[PDB]
Write an enzyme that holds these catalytic residues in place. Structure first.
Site, PDB file in Angstrom:
ATOM      1  N   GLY A   1       0.934  -1.258   0.001  1.00 16.95           N
ATOM      2  CA  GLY A   1       0.015   0.089   0.116  1.00 16.95           C
ATOM      3  C   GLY A   1       0.930   1.018   0.051  1.00 16.95           C
TER       4      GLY A   1
ATOM      5  N   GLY B   1       1.002   5.825  -0.055  1.00 17.61           N
ATOM      6  CA  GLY B   1       0.332   7.068   0.395  1.00 17.61           C
ATOM      7  C   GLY B   1       1.196   8.298   0.192  1.00 17.61           C
TER       8      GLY B   1
ATOM      9  N   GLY C   1       3.912   7.796   3.011  1.00 14.74           N
ATOM     10  CA  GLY C   1       4.197   6.609   3.161  1.00 14.74           C
ATOM     11  C   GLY C   1       3.826   5.446   2.568  1.00 14.74           C
TER      12      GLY C   1
ATOM     13  CB  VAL D   1       2.089  -0.856   4.365  1.00 13.92           C
ATOM     14  CG1 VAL D   1       2.343  -2.021   5.364  1.00 13.92           C
ATOM     15  CG2 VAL D   1       1.437   0.325   5.255  1.00 13.92           C
TER      16      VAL D   1
ATOM     17  CE  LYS E   1       1.225   4.433   8.745  1.00  9.44           C
ATOM     18  NZ  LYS E   1       0.072   4.374   9.250  1.00  9.44           N
TER      19      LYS E   1
ATOM     20  CE1 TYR F   1       0.491  -9.231   4.388  1.00  4.98           C
ATOM     21  CE2 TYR F   1       1.180 -11.605   4.492  1.00  4.98           C
ATOM     22  CZ  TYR F   1       0.363 -10.431   3.885  1.00  4.98           C
ATOM     23  OH  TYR F   1       0.155 -10.708   2.466  1.00  4.98           O
TER      24      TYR F   1
ATOM     25  N   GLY G   1      -6.121  -9.795   3.271  1.00  3.31           N
ATOM     26  CA  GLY G   1      -6.708  -8.383   2.683  1.00  3.31           C
ATOM     27  C   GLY G   1      -7.510  -7.850   3.184  1.00  3.31           C
TER      28      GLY G   1
ATOM     29  CG  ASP H   1      -8.622   6.534   8.781  1.00  4.13           C
ATOM     30  OD1 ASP H   1      -9.739   7.046   8.005  1.00  4.13           O
ATOM     31  OD2 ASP H   1      -7.589   6.312   8.174  1.00  4.13           O
TER      32      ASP H   1
ATOM     33  CE  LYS I   1      -9.259   4.802   4.909  1.00  6.81           C
ATOM     34  NZ  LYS I   1      -9.003   5.776   4.148  1.00  6.81           N
TER      35      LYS I   1
ATOM     36  CG  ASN J   1      -8.098   2.212   7.714  1.00  2.85           C
ATOM     37  OD1 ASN J   1      -7.364   1.962   6.829  1.00  2.85           O
ATOM     38  ND2 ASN J   1      -8.300   3.435   8.246  1.00  2.85           N
TER      39      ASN J   1
ATOM     40  CG  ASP K   1      -3.858   4.128   8.845  1.00  2.00           C
ATOM     41  OD1 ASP K   1      -3.443   4.947   9.587  1.00  2.00           O
ATOM     42  OD2 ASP K   1      -4.069   4.372   7.454  1.00  2.00           O
TER      43      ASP K   1
ATOM     44  CB  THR L   1     -12.131   8.566   4.814  1.00  2.00           C
ATOM     45  OG1 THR L   1     -10.847   8.047   5.114  1.00  2.00           O
ATOM     46  CG2 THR L   1     -12.435   8.509   3.152  1.00  2.00           C
TER      47      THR L   1
HETATM   48  N1  LIG Z   1      -0.729  -5.130   9.233  1.00  2.00           N
HETATM   49  C1  LIG Z   1      -0.885  -5.209   7.904  1.00  2.00           C
HETATM   50  N2  LIG Z   1      -1.071  -6.371   7.558  1.00  2.00           N
HETATM   51  C2  LIG Z   1      -1.191  -6.493   6.000  1.00  2.00           C
HETATM   52  N3  LIG Z   1      -1.502  -5.777   5.055  1.00  2.00           N
HETATM   53  C3  LIG Z   1      -1.550  -4.350   5.833  1.00  2.00           C
HETATM   54  C4  LIG Z   1      -1.786  -3.382   4.770  1.00  2.00           C
HETATM   55  C5  LIG Z   1      -1.804  -2.099   5.444  1.00  2.00           C
HETATM   56  C6  LIG Z   1      -1.445  -1.932   6.811  1.00  2.00           C
HETATM   57  N4  LIG Z   1      -1.241  -2.884   7.557  1.00  2.00           N
HETATM   58  C7  LIG Z   1      -1.133  -4.167   6.953  1.00  2.00           C
END
Ligand SMILES: Nc1ncnc2cccnc12
EC number: 2.7.11.11
Length: 338
Positions: free
Chosen positions: A38, A40, A43, A45, A60, A110, A114, A154, A156, A159, A172, A189
């Site tokens: 991801g 932005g 930053g 991730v 992140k 992780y 999704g 936040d 949504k 997240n 997030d 948002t």
């Molecule tokens: N902790 C996370 N695990 C997997 N995908 C992510 C994507 C954005 C933010 N955090 C994560």
């Protein structure tokens, strides 16, 4: 009393870590970079792999110079200080943090299943039992956060990550803040903003409960209740006091949503004298076993399809850009506490 004693211990443990935050518990070259998950304006991730243990993590990475420029300094310090202090079954776990000359780093577990956003868009809409399963986890998470004097700000679908057991992990904390009383920052948002945020009022935890109303509507309809091409047009609908419900919504769902999407914050569910119990006791949640949800004993509506802890098939493809670290320290003073 069991709930009172639970929350009392939760606050005790939070405050101990809040008052003495962990710092500098790993470094960048302990990890291999796998994939961008991801990105932005300040930053991204990354999926990384710890070189000694082989564990996967979502890292992140915040560019300090862009954080300063986009005026997110206090917010990024909020995010890390809160994340290192919280502990709840539906909050993503922070495992390490550290900084270098260029970037701030937060290394989290992780979650391979999704974002809820992808699954909702792939199926169209969730059934009410399916939406209720996710909503119950958010209600409990907000009960936890609000008792710690934290506002999330936040909520949504993007997240909310779906884990290997099909439960939610909130990610997030970029806008999360410890607040006794009111706060004033314009953030969130557009589709999910409470009217009092749009009107520049001093606001409180009630904006999270408004956002839960938007989220339940969106899960059950497939689209959010206030939609438009320009944000200004979204804001006019939000402050109007008018929401249209699809005919397939149950009467219980419509009643709960009218009370969460209440434009008058002093009449909004979650912000009344009975607090969260006006929500937990609502007829739409009559089938919910709150303890079973907390204990993760309820069978989930679905388990994401993935092959193992390093599978990224439930995330999308982004341009792979360098993680550059300047030879000179940037913004040292501003991020001293990180
Ligand atoms: N902790 C996370 N695990 C997997 N995908 C992510 C994507 C954005 C933010 N955090 C994560």
């Amino acid at each position: 009393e069991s709930v009172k004693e639970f929350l009392a211990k939760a606050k005790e443990e939070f405050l101990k870590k809040w008052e003495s935050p962990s710092q500098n518990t790993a470094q960048l070259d302990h990890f291999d970079r796998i994939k961008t998950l991801g990105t932005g304006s300040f930053g991204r991730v990354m999926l990384v792999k710890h070189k000694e243990t082989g564990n996967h993590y979502a890292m992140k990475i915040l560019d300090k110079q862009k954080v300063v420029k986009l005026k997110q300094i206090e917010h990024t310090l909020n995010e890390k200080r809160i994340l290192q202090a919280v502990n709840f079954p539906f909050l993503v776990k922070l495992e390490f943090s550290f900084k270098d000359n260029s970037n701030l780093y937060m290394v989290m577990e992780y979650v391979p299943g999704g974002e809820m956003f992808s699954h909702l868009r792939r199926i169209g809409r969730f059934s009410e039992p399916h939406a209720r399963f996710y909503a119950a986890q958010i209600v409990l998470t907000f009960e936890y956060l609000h008792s710690l004097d934290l506002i999330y700000r936040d909520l949504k679908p993007e997240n909310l990550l779906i884990d290997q057991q099909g439960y939610i992990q909130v990610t997030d904390f970029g806008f999360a803040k410890r607040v006794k009383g009111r706060t004033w920052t314009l953030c969130g948002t557009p589709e999910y903003l409470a009217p009092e945020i749009i009107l520049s009022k001093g606001y409180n935890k009630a904006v999270d409960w408004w956002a839960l109303g938007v989220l339940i509507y969106e899960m059950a309809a497939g689209y959010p209740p206030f939609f438009a091409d320009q944000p200004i047009q979204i804001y006019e609908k939000i402050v109007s006091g008018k929401v249209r419900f699809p005919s397939h919504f149950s009467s219980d769902l419509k009643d709960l949503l009218r009370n969460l999407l209440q434009v008058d914050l002093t009449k909004r569910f979650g912000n009344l004298k009975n607090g969260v119990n006006d929500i937990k006791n609502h007829k739409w949640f009559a089938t919910t076993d709150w303890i079973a949800i907390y204990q993760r004993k309820v069978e989930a509506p679905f388990i994401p399809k993935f092959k193992g802890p390093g599978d990224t098939s439930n995330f999308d493809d982004y341009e792979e850009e360098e993680i550059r670290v300047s030879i000179n320290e940037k913004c040292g003073k501003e991020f001293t506490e990180f």
